[PDB]
Amino acid sequence: EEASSTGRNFNVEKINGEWHTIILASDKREKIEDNGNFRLFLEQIHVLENSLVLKFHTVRDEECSELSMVADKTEKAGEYSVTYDGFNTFTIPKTDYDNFLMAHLINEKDGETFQLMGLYGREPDLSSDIKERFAQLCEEHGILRENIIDLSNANR
Numbered sequence: 159e160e161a162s163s164t165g166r167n168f169n170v171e172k173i174n175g176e177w178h179t180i181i182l183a184s185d186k187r188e189k190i191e192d193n194g195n196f197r198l199f200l201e202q203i204h205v206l207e208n209s210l211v212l213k214f215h216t217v218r219d220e221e222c223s224e225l226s227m228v229a230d231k232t233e234k235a236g237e238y239s240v241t242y243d244g245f246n247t248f249t250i251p252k253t254d255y256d257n258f259l260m261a262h263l264i265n266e267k268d269g270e271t272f273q274l275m276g277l278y279g280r281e282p283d284l285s286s287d288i289k290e291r292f293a294q295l296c297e298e299h300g301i302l303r304e305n306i307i308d309l310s311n312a313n314r
């Protein structure tokens with residue numbers, strides 16, 4: 159079964175648990191490159207009543223560092239917000255709960271905005287068909303292939 163956080167049939171409780179960053183894409187490529195502060199490796203999502211606890215790690219020359227954030231529900235169904243290097247709001251355009259999850263985020267800081275989309279998996283890698291389906295969604299949002307980074311061999 160596939161759902162959108164924006165849909166009426168979305169069951170947030172089902173995204174609880176372990177996840178992995180598989181692919182990241184952005185409007186502004188430098189934010190997800192090597193020393194980018196948005197190059198985050200998701201490890202777990204803990205679902206709360208009106209919030210989402212997010213646990214990640216960042217990596218610098220293979221050294222990993224823990225990072226946690228709490229995203230709160232906004233007034234729009236299926237949308238959360240979190241303050242991190244500016245103000246961010248995000249939704250989950252597509253997920254099947256037990257395999258993949260696609261996220262869409264908009265960052266705003268000092269009159270400037272950029273978008274970030276990510277593909278996460280319950281396992282550290284996903285099939286090529288799902289990866290290509292993600293590339294197609296990125297295209298719909300105006301993000302081209304040169305700005306999509308597959309991190310499946312850098313996510314552990």
Ligand SMILES: CC[C@H](C)c1nccs1
Nearest residue numbers: 198240242248261263276
């Ligand atoms: C679900 C993961 C989303 C896209 C986030 N990345 C940075 C802050 S929230």
